[PDB]
Amino acid sequence: QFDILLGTYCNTLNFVRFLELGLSVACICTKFP
């Protein structure tokens, strides 16, 4: 008898545009040292 392993797969999720929408329509970035 013997055992055979299939393998290991990693999840590759996607993303959405947030840098040009969330920081442009909701909040405004302004540096103030």
Place this chain on the structure above:
Amino acid sequence: VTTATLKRQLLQGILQIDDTAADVPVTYGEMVLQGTNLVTALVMGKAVRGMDDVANARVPADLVI
């Protein structure tokens, strides 16, 4: 997947035929069997399938929207 009288009632009520012909591509994939599999099986007994992380025909059908 629908059948029986449920399919008939669906097509009578809300489902309408849009397409008549469709094609299905054929894709076959064979894994590599050349390497250290034979020696590792004869010295150990078990095998591990690695190499997973580095870094036509016309058949009628009906489609609804």
Place this chain on the structure above:
Amino acid sequence: ELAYVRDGVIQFEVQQPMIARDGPHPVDQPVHNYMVKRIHKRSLSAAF
């Protein structure tokens, strides 16, 4: 080269985004949990 597999073990890894907050509520830290499972093998019979 298909033969008996005698079931086996599996492993999955899905990235889950965390949250950031502060105040009276205690802070939250990311955690990792791994759960193992098994498989079932069917039987095929055909004779005349």
